[PDB]
Amino acid sequence: DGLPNKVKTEDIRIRAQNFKSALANLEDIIFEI
Amino acid sequence: NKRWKVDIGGKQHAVLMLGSVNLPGGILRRKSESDELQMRSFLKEGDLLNAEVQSLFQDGSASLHTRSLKYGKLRNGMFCQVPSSLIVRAKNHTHNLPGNITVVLGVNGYIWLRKTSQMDLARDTSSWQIYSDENDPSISNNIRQAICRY
Amino acid sequence: NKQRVIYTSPIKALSNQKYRELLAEFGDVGLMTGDITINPDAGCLVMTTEILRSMLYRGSEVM
Amino acid sequence: MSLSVAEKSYLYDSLASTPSIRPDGRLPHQFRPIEIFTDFLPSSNGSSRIIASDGSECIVSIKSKVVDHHVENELLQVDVDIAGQRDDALVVETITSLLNKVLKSGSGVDSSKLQLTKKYSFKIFVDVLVISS
Amino acid sequence: MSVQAEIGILDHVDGSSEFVSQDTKVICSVTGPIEPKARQELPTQLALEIIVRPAKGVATTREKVLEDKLRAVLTPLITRHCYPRQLCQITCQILESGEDEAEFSLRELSCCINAAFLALVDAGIALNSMCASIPIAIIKDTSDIIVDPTAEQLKISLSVHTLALEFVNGGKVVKNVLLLDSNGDFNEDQLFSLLELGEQKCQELVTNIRRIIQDNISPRLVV
Amino acid sequence: YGIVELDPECQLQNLNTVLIADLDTEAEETSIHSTISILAAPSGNYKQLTLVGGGAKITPEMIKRSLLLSRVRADDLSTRFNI
Amino acid sequence: ETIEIHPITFPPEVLARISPELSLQRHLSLGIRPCLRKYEEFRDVAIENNTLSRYADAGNIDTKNNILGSNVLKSGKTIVITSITGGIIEETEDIIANYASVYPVVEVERGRVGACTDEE
Amino acid sequence: QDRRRLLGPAAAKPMAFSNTESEQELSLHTGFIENCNGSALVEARSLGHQTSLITAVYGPRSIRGSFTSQGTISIQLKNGLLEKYNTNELKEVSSFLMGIFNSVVNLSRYPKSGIDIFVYLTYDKDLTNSQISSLIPHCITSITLALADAGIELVDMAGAGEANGTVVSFIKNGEEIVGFWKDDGDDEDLLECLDRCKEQYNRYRDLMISCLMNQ
Amino acid sequence: KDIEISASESKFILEALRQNYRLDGRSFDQFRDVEITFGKEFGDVSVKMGNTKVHCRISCQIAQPYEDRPFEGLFVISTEISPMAGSQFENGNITGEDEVLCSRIIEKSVRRSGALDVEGLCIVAGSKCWAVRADVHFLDCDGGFIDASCIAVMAGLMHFKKPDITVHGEQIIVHPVNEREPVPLGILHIPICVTFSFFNPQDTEENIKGETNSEISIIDATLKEELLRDGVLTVTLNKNREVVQVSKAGGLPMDALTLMKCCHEAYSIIEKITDQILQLLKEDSEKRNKYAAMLTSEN
Amino acid sequence: SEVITITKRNGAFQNSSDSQIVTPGEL
Amino acid sequence: MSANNGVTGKLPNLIISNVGYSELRKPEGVISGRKTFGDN
Amino acid sequence: IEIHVLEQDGGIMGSLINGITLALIDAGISMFDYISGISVGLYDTTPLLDTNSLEENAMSTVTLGVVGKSEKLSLLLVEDKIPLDRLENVLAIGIAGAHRVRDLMDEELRKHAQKRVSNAS
Amino acid sequence: MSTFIFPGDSFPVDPTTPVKLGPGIYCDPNTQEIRPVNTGVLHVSAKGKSGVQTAYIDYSSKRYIPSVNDFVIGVIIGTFSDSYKVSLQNFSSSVSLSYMAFPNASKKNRPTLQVGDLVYARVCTAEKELEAEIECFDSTTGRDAGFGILEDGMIIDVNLNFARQLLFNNDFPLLKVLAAHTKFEVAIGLNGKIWVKCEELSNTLACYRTIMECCQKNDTAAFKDIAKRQFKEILTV
Amino acid sequence: PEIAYPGKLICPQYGTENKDGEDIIFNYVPGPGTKLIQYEHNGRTLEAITATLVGTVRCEEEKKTDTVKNILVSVLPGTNDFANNLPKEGDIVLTRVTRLSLQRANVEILAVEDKPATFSVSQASSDLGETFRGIIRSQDVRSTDRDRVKVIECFKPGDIVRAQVLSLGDGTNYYLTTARNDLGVVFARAANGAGGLMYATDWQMMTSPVTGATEKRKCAKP
């Protein structure tokens, strides 16, 4: 529609905890050629 | 870099090599590259000392050193300064005056007074204190006011 | 003990014997001669008699 | 100046004596000897020339001007120059702004003596040149 | 196509070009790579500093933005990694207005890009692609669109437009847009039409240009 | 507006060419190189448009998308504070 | 040689200071913004108008003020305040010559002392 | 004229017009500038006079000059929108500012490090039908809150109180004075000039510590 | 930003003067040849002397005069160097010394000298006058700028025309350009400056107490020539044999008897070049009017 | 028994073995 | 050379990288840069 | 070199240089020679040694930076408009003035110079 | 009618070829692609060269880019200890030269050159991004003392492609006609520097004025009479 | 004594317990956030440990082994600050390479770690030239083969180095080193940003995965 949707404050914290999670854990070992 | 700049009062600064100075503990303290990591330890800006004119450069700028215990960083008194002209040349320059005090006449026009030390008394009959900002804590006013009269 | 040391001689060729000998031996040896100086800031110093006297008059910090 | 730390104790020692001691040993309320010259710039309304003991040196000039004392509020202006410094510097501007306050027109200044007419008066210029300090 | 150009017409400067379109005479100069200043270096890429002098008056804010948008366009033209810790000062001179500087800046922005492009070729610096700019206006009263208008047509123009394109593969593929300077009143619908001639025309411009470069420089080249 | 192009290497599991607007945050302002800035009055009007294309290509559609995103962000603010 | 090269990872606040670009590329992997937003999440805009003009109080317009119509703007993490004055010179359809503008002066208090910055 | 700015055509002129114990009050706020590391917001309103101003911190910035043992403070006063205080009038206050914080800040904790202080005399009402002297003590308060926000080593919440053209700055709950400023007033009113300043200082520092410890 | 030349190259030219040679191919006392070409605009000209290239521009507009001389119009010359003309230069340094050495000359060469009647800029006294502008651009340097900008400005004044005016109090009627003709300007005298360039082949003392004058002076130092010279001197004169300015601001010491002997040779040089301007102004305007004859018969 | 030396002089800018003594420029 | 050891003696493509123009002339630096010109 | 212009009486350029020539010798810096400076003005035919600012605004003036006893010049500066034919004669004027300048500088230093050693020793 | 090119053209050669890169072409460090990035004419190295060919663009410049194994002419501008300050072109970056990189390499022996001298030297080691370095004496000299400091002479600036033709090319007609009048020396600098010393300054000016004019006109066939005329212009006397 | 405003007077220099009949003396030792301040009140002097900052009290002790009791007073923030964690001698600091000299290497200070990982990045903007910069001299890169040092073979501009503080040096820059097998290069992009990400092949070497290209960097032990 284009109608204003205010951001839930609680989401982005969980986003940040999602962002902290997949960062430090999946960046440990990189198995490559 | 391993150098110091220091005013004579003349045209330019003198220079002063890093190992040109009396080390605490003496020569048993030999060389170290960590000493340039501590240039500011032994010396810093504006401070006053006794220095011995070694030799020159191609221009007329000359350098210094402290080849004695007698040369070193000042304390125990007060500075004054004069024109270089009136200071007369003699075979001696450290002078000891009644009032238990000592003039250190520079040639260049720089004049330090301080209280007579034992090393001063030694001239006419510990070593780790050669970069201190300390004085003798025992300084009477009868010392101090006698300084101002001279 | 990281100290410097003076080895003396009256003759250049006395030193030229002892230099290349010690140069083979420890390497890090300064030679001082009226003819040839080598490696002025080395730890060990070999030099003739008057050079000490000369660098005792004007106070080498080398000392 | 740049002085040495070992002095700075002794200097802070001797002056903080309870029988307090100056480095020149004056009495604590004394000033130092000076010299005072004036009346030497004959193009000016007044001149001045003063000499310190350490050789600090200034001259302040007096030029006047007739003005309407109604269209202008400040009847008396100070303007200062220190040799060796930019206009933009701090010690310049504060001392400059100070003496204006010191010579506000009716605070210690008797602007009635400056008054020329019922319509006019005298704009004055405190113009200052410090050689050295 | 009453355009014409000169290459290599200064002396002590690395890259020099006179660009002459229909009414405006503009010369650009390029000096680089040369010694950069202290406050100016980049550890990796090439630092660029750009000076435009107007024909009239002095350097003010009106000049400043035409500079700065021109900063944006050159930055991908330059193979900037090739010259680390370096500087190329580039300088443009407006000599002729050809447009009311009080009311417009349009043609000059088209002109100076077309000017500075060629002095870099004189300069022979590592570059990336080929380029062109044209001025485009839309008339207020007629409601039609002219490529390369005049200043009196600018007076009756409703909206003024500069398009900068990136040309490769014989200068034929629009690799990217560089600048689209939409000014004046416009809508959705005009805009894709507004590209669609300049889609052709700038290539048609470069089609002239590709010839001109080699004609000027292959006799400067040796065989 | 900003349009970027993407590395395969940079992924963390929880071509590809993304439009971002409302640009901020120095890292963004460093690294976005093809950009779009638009003026628009809410009835479909346009005072200006500003393209600096220095990174990605520009599609005709990110144009229209930004245009679609233009008339929203403006028109809300026209109606937001009703002055 | 196929090698498990273990990389070295950091706190995210470490990373952005180091790499503005790759830390962005971390956010693009999830498809977010390093301002913690998703792609099209847009900042709020908040104003107050007319507070700093003297014409704020319609009832009692004060004496020594000289401001015509004022605007406060905060959006995100940047507060910008707009002030309008006007001057007068003695003066002696839709074409550009009918059209005038104002004279603005911007300052960005970006910590740097000195002259007028080129961004401004 | 000035070739660096837009100042209009020269022959224009701005517009002209002609004639046709009380409470002070605060609203103190921190943490709202992301360029800085210390920010502070001050509202003031008193009896004819409403005042708002911003104090900005940048530190510790590097010094390209030389070595120092310790830190160095730099303070800027800049006109905001309406009120225009004189240029030389500004820096005198900036001189008076630095003296007090040199009895505040542990510079010895901060060798070779700079302190940048930007003060924005943003907007002032004086609707009353030494005009800078009435705004001195609020600066020190506005600086102290921002300097707490950058978290720099400060000895005391020092504050100044005002009594009728007189500014006196305190510490130790008023048991020592750190900064003295006097204009015309009476003669030997000093003893009352101790008091009304002190109690505002006794008011203000409590208002300050409420602004932070409750956050 | 520093020009570096070997001392070997320094002696080389100094030897060439000691055998009466100079690298350009001119005589010592010979000046370059001057190419003057106008743009289509009035007050538009491109001036070129071999390597040195300049361009300037004359314009005018409406303003009020000062309180200072409320009778007279307004006029000033900009000479802002761009580093386009050589990489030595700052971006618009109005505070460099050589810039001032370019400045004060042209300040005295034009403004204090008054070749142009500023009183003939008075449209109405104190109300509206002219603001006449002279922006000097440098293109590429081989020296002689201050002689080139001497010429190219005075070239530009003899090619600019101002449009038509009618006064009724405030009703000041600037007419359309093409109905009512633009009107040229009033030049009291035409000044031409001359650079002189000085070379001690000796030490200081043989210039100082060596009584023998032995110092070589040439005209129009080229770029390499200019970097080693020892004194700097510029004189300016007219057709009516009066001396406009002289400026030896220091440098090498220099005999007086040389300078008069120098300045006489200036006279015969500048006169021929002056008239070459005078024909070309006519001849271009003749070419304007012959093309005006090629216009009205065409239209 | 004083504080300062204040002695006044108004109306003026200022109060106003043999060997060769030579000057620069001199033979 | 005797002075040192005589004491011991008596006892997805095919990329080959950038090159200077020095290597683009074939005798490869035997070209003497400093020529005087002999008698004629 | 620090300058403080206090009272201004015209002839301002050559006034400076004569003050300079003191100040370098005032520390005794190494040099070659005296250097003299003087503005000399021209009322219609007639040279005027040592003009003032009233006369400076009244006619055409030239200042000469003259070196020592010589006939060689350091400074030569002309702002006003000058007929050519006087100028050789005009230049021939100022030397006798300029020689009397470095004249009066010399002894005035010398009588100071005597005052040193006679009371130093 | 050449292998003329622009930056942004189609690169001609197939990708599967072992090819030594010449200058003027750039390989992408980001996307591994390789493109011509300068203006002018390609010249393909012909086949048979070990099966490895080479591309290079003729591009024109005056501003010299420091690159290795290249003979340039330099100016002593500072005595940064152990290691000279030397410049190669005005307004460019200074170059560093060892005090020891010299044909009698001797570390106790410090050589003699002073600020403002002209020296002949070859670029030894120079990254694109690092403080570049040169050598007079080299290992690639193979103990040759063929570079060195110069005497007085005279040095003239030209553009670079001309200076290549001075070095790389015997068909370059210049050295013929010059030897056909007088006998002299020549140093060739790839920094656009040409240092000449004659027996005479008189002929050196004759040497000067030709090289200014010829490189300006850049028409090698015409240089017969143009060179000889300046002799008559000196033999004007 | 729990939560502190700057100026919160906390405790004297000395305190006393009686732990089981024998008298035990406290020694309150000033740390960061502290200052002993003398206080005369109604005549008598008094030294006191003073809160100089914002946050929490923390009192600790440790005696050096290699009836009085020393107690270190320590003051903290508590629920973003780096002037708290200004670099001292010997610290491990993550930096970005600014410029490569033949003499030496120049970096700017960005992030300081901590002891028993815990960090403190600087919150400053380098685009002002704001931050503290330091210098690595080329002979100080490592100690193994410390003479014939080839500087380009370990560093390039813009790269990340785990380096140790040597000392203060001047006010302008720092004395810094990497001279360990655990120290040195942390991370960079290929061809200084012109290519992808690069991984340390050994402790002594570095390659890049997708490229097939390696470079010599004095990498850290991973």
Q: Write a three-state SS string for C28-51.
A: CEEEECCCCCECCCCCEEEEEHHH
* Beta-strand relationship, E173-184 and F48-53: antiparallel
What are the angstrom distances between the C-alpha of H129 and each of E3, G56, N169? 68, 18, 60
What are the angstrom distances between the C-alpha of M83 and each of B2, D68, E158, M113, M145? 19, 73, 65, 12, 19
Q: Which residues of J touch L114 (CB under 8 A)?
A: 21
- Point out residues after which chain K has a gap (C–N over 2.5 Å): 11
Give the list of residues 6+ apart from residue I169 with CB closer than 8 angstroms, or none. Answer: none
Please give the distance of CA H178 from its chain centroid, rounded to a whole number.
15
Give the list of residues 6+ apart from residue F46 with CB closer than 8 angstroms, or none. Answer: E182, E185, E186, E187, F38, F39, F40, F70
CA proximity to N191, closest of E84, E42, G10:
E84
* Beta-strand relationship, I216-219 and L60-67: unpaired
Instruction: Say if residues N36 and N46 touch (Cβ distance below 8 Å).
Output: no
In the 8-state DSSP scheme, what is residue M147?
S
Query: What are the φ/ψ torsions at residue N27 (nearest 5 degrees)?
Result: -125, 100
What are the angstrom distances between the C-alpha of B32 and each of B19, B27, C4, I117, I252? 10, 12, 12, 79, 54
Measured N-to-C along each axis, helices L87-120 and L12-27 cross at an angle, to the nearest 10 degrees, of 30
**The two three-digit tokens of residue B113, written as one number:** 């007074």
CA dihedral I143, I148, I149, I152 (to 10 degrees): -150
Instruction: Say if residues H166 and H197 touch (Cβ distance below 8 Å).
Output: yes
In the 8-state DSSP scheme, what is residue M88?
S
Cα–Cα distance measured from residue N25 to residue N48, given in angstroms and rounded to the nearest whole number: 16
In the 8-state DSSP scheme, what is residue D23?
S
CB count, 10 Å around CB of A6?
Answer: 6
CA proximity to I3, closest of M133, M187, M92:
M92
Give the H or E element holding residue I53.
strand I52-63
What are the angstrom distances between the C-alpha of A26 and each of A30, G6, H142? 9, 11, 46
In the 8-state DSSP scheme, what is residue M49?
S
Query: What are the φ/ψ torsions at residue E197 (nearest 5 degrees)?
Result: -75, -45
Please give the distance of CA N55 from its chain centroid, rounded to a whole number.
21
What are the angstrom distances between the C-alpha of A30 and each of D128, L27, M41? 75, 76, 46
Find residue I75's DSSP bridge partners.
I132
**The two three-digit tokens of residue D16, written as one number:** 């903080």
CA proximity to G23, closest of D25, F25, I214, N115:
F25
**The two three-digit tokens of residue I16, written as one number:** 């060439």
Instruction: Say if residues M130 and E86 touch (Cβ distance below 8 Å).
Output: no
Cα–Cα distance measured from residue N174 to residue H195, given in angstroms and rounded to the nearest whole number: 51
CB count, 10 Å around CB of B69?
Answer: 12
**Which chains reach chain L with 3 or more Cβ–Cβ distances below 8 angstroms?**
D, I, J
What are the angstrom distances between the C-alpha of B129 and each of B118, E56, L19, M164, N67? 14, 72, 53, 69, 34
Q: Is H62 helix (H, G, I), strand (E, B) or coil?
A: strand
CB count, 10 Å around CB of I224?
Answer: 18
CA proximity to N57, closest of N131, N2, N139, N137:
N2
Residue contact H156–N5, C-beta within 8 A: no
Cα–Cα distance measured from residue H167 to residue H169, given in angstroms and rounded to the nearest whole number: 7
Q: Which residues of H touch E61 (CB under 8 A)?
A: 4-6
Give the H or E element holding residue I145.
helix I145-157
Residue contact H118–G83, C-beta within 8 A: no
Find residue G70's DSSP bridge partners.
none
Instruction: Say if residues I213 and I255 touch (Cβ distance below 8 Å).
Output: yes
Cα–Cα distance measured from residue G1 to residue C11, given in angstroms and rounded to the nearest whole number: 64
**Which chains reach chain C with 3 or more Cβ–Cβ distances below 8 angstroms?**
B, M
**The two three-digit tokens of residue E4, written as one number:** 């014409």
**The two three-digit tokens of residue N193, written as one number:** 């940003």
Q: Which residues of C touch B70 (CB under 8 A)?
A: none
Cα–Cα distance measured from residue I1 to residue E46, given in angstroms and rounded to the nearest whole number: 19
N83 in contact with M, Cβ within 8 Å: no
Contacts 24+ apart (CB under 8 A), D106-111: D107/H184, D109/D76, D111/D69, D111/D75, D111/D76
**Side by side, which strands form the sheet with C44-48?**
C5-9, C44-48, C29-32
Residue H60 preceded by cis peptide, ω within 30: yes
Residue contact G28–F81, C-beta within 8 A: no
**The two three-digit tokens of residue L6, written as one number:** 């206090």
Residue contact J24–L114, C-beta within 8 A: no
> b/e for I41-69, b at 16 or more Cβ within 10 A?
ebbbbbbbbbbbbbbbbbbbeebbbeeee
Instruction: Say if residues F25 and F38 touch (Cβ distance below 8 Å).
Output: no
Give the list of residues 6+ apart from residue H108 with CB closer than 8 angstroms, or none. Answer: H69, H70, H71
Find residue M184's DSSP bridge partners.
M198
Q: Is L25 helix (H, G, I), strand (E, B) or coil?
A: helix
In the 8-state DSSP scheme, what is residue G22?
H
**The two three-digit tokens of residue G96, written as one number:** 């550009």
Cα–Cα distance measured from residue I281 to residue I158, given in angstroms and rounded to the nearest whole number: 7
Give the list of residues 6+ apart from residue J3 with CB closer than 8 angstroms, or none. Answer: D29, D30, D31
Which domains, from first to last, does chain I contain? 5-299 (3.30.230.70)
Instruction: Say if residues E37 and E76 touch (Cβ distance below 8 Å).
Output: no
Instruction: Say if residues F20 and F34 touch (Cβ distance below 8 Å).
Output: no
Measured N-to-C along each axis, helices H87-101 and D90-102 cross at an angle, to the nearest 10 degrees, of 110
Give the H or E element holding residue H173.
none
Q: Is N120 helix (H, G, I), strand (E, B) or coil?
A: strand
SS3 annotation, M37-48: CCCEEECCCCCC
**The two three-digit tokens of residue I276, written as one number:** 């070459």
Q: Among N85, N95, N96, N121, pick the best mutation site for testing chain G contact (most G Cβ within 10 A).
A: N121
In the 8-state DSSP scheme, what is residue C56?
H
CA proximity to N206, closest of N141, N160, N148, N139:
N160
B111: exposed, middle or buried (Cβ count in 10 Å: 0-12, 13-18, 19+): middle
**The two three-digit tokens of residue D104, written as one number:** 């506000």
Cα–Cα distance measured from residue I86 to residue I142, given in angstroms and rounded to the nearest whole number: 9
Helices (H), chain B: 39-42, 118-122, 141-149
What are the angstrom distances between the C-alpha of I155 and each of I57, I112, I289? 10, 18, 19
DSSP conformation letters of I82-135: -GGG-TTS-TT-SS-HHHHHHHHHHIIIIIITT-B-SGGGEEETTTEEEEEEEE
Find residue H161's DSSP bridge partners.
H168
- Residue among G93, G95, G118 whose CB faces E155 most closely: G95
CB count, 10 Å around CB of M197?
Answer: 20
Cα–Cα distance measured from residue M100 to residue E15, given in angstroms and rounded to the nearest whole number: 38
Amino acid of residue F13: Q
Contacts 24+ apart (CB under 8 A), A6-12: A6/G44, A7/G37, A7/G41, A12/G36, A12/G37
What are the angstrom distances between the C-alpha of H120 and each of D123, G2, H57, H143, H179? 34, 61, 12, 11, 21
Min Cα distance N134 → chain B (Å) is 14
E60 in contact with H, Cβ within 8 Å: yes
CA proximity to E83, closest of N77, G65, M26:
M26
* Beta-strand relationship, I231-237 and I242-255: antiparallel
Cα–Cα distance measured from residue D10 to residue D4, given in angstroms and rounded to the nearest whole number: 10
Cα–Cα distance measured from residue H42 to residue H48, given in angstroms and rounded to the nearest whole number: 17
Give the H or E element holding residue C19.
helix C12-25
What are the angstrom distances between the C-alpha of B118 and each of B115, B124, B126, I120? 10, 10, 11, 92
Tell me the residue length of chain N. 222
In the 8-state DSSP scheme, what is residue M13?
S
**The two three-digit tokens of residue I98, written as one number:** 């050589």
E63: exposed, middle or buried (Cβ count in 10 Å: 0-12, 13-18, 19+): buried
In the 8-state DSSP scheme, what is residue F56?
S
Instruction: Say if residues M64 and M178 touch (Cβ distance below 8 Å).
Output: no
Give the list of residues 6+ apart from residue L104 with CB closer than 8 angstroms, or none. Answer: none
Give the list of residues 6+ apart from residue D40 with CB closer than 8 angstroms, or none. Answer: D47, D49, J11, J12, J13
Give the list of residues 6+ apart from residue H18 with CB closer than 8 angstroms, or none. Answer: none
Find residue N71's DSSP bridge partners.
N28
Give the list of residues 6+ apart from residue K16 with CB closer than 8 angstroms, or none. Answer: M18, M19, M20, M21, M52
The domain defined by H5-215 folds into Ribosomal Protein S5; domain 2 (3.30.230)
Instruction: Say if residues N215 and N186 touch (Cβ distance below 8 Å).
Output: no
CA proximity to E222, closest of N18, M43, D19:
M43
> b/e for C45-60, b at 16 or more Cβ within 10 A?
bbbbeebbeebeeebb
Domain ranges of chain H: 5-215
CA proximity to E161, closest of F61, F54, F46:
F46
Residue for token digits 């309407």? D68
What are the angstrom distances between the C-alpha of E108 and each of E2, E50, K35, N34? 16, 15, 52, 65
Give the list of residues 6+ apart from residue L65 with CB closer than 8 angstroms, or none. Answer: I248, I250, L14, L17, L35, L36, L37, L73, L74, L75, L76
Give the H or E element holding residue K11.
none
Cα–Cα distance measured from residue I113 to residue I130, given in angstroms and rounded to the nearest whole number: 19
Instruction: Say if residues B78 and D7 touch (Cβ distance below 8 Å).
Output: yes
Give the list of residues 6+ apart from residue N76 with CB closer than 8 angstroms, or none. Answer: N33, N53, N55, N56, N58
Interface of A with F in 1-33 (CB under 8 A): 2, 4, 18, 22-23, 26-27
I55 in contact with E, Cβ within 8 Å: yes
Instruction: Say if residues E170 and E187 touch (Cβ distance below 8 Å).
Output: no
Tell me the residue length of chain M. 237
Give the list of residues 6+ apart from residue B143 with CB closer than 8 angstroms, or none. Answer: B99, B100, B101, B115
Q: Which residues of F touch E185 (CB under 8 A)?
A: 45-47
Please give the distance of CA M127 from its chain centroid, rounded to a whole number.
18
Instruction: Say if residues E203 and E172 touch (Cβ distance below 8 Å).
Output: yes
Instruction: Say if residues E216 and M4 touch (Cβ distance below 8 Å).
Output: no
H85 in contact with G, Cβ within 8 Å: no
Find residue I134's DSSP bridge partners.
I58, I77
CA proximity to I5, closest of I215, I284, I222:
I222
Residue contact L68–I208, C-beta within 8 A: yes
Min Cα distance L57 → chain I (Å) is 13
Residue contact I19–M91, C-beta within 8 A: no
Give the list of residues 6+ apart from residue E51 with CB closer than 8 angstroms, or none. Answer: E59, E67, E89, E90, E91, E92, I82, I83, I84, I91
Cα–Cα distance measured from residue H30 to residue H214, given in angstroms and rounded to the nearest whole number: 12
Cα–Cα distance measured from residue E74 to residue E62, given in angstroms and rounded to the nearest whole number: 20
Cα–Cα distance measured from residue L102 to residue L109, given in angstroms and rounded to the nearest whole number: 11
DSSP conformation letters of H121-154: EEEEEE----TTGGGHHHHHHHHHHHHHHTT--B
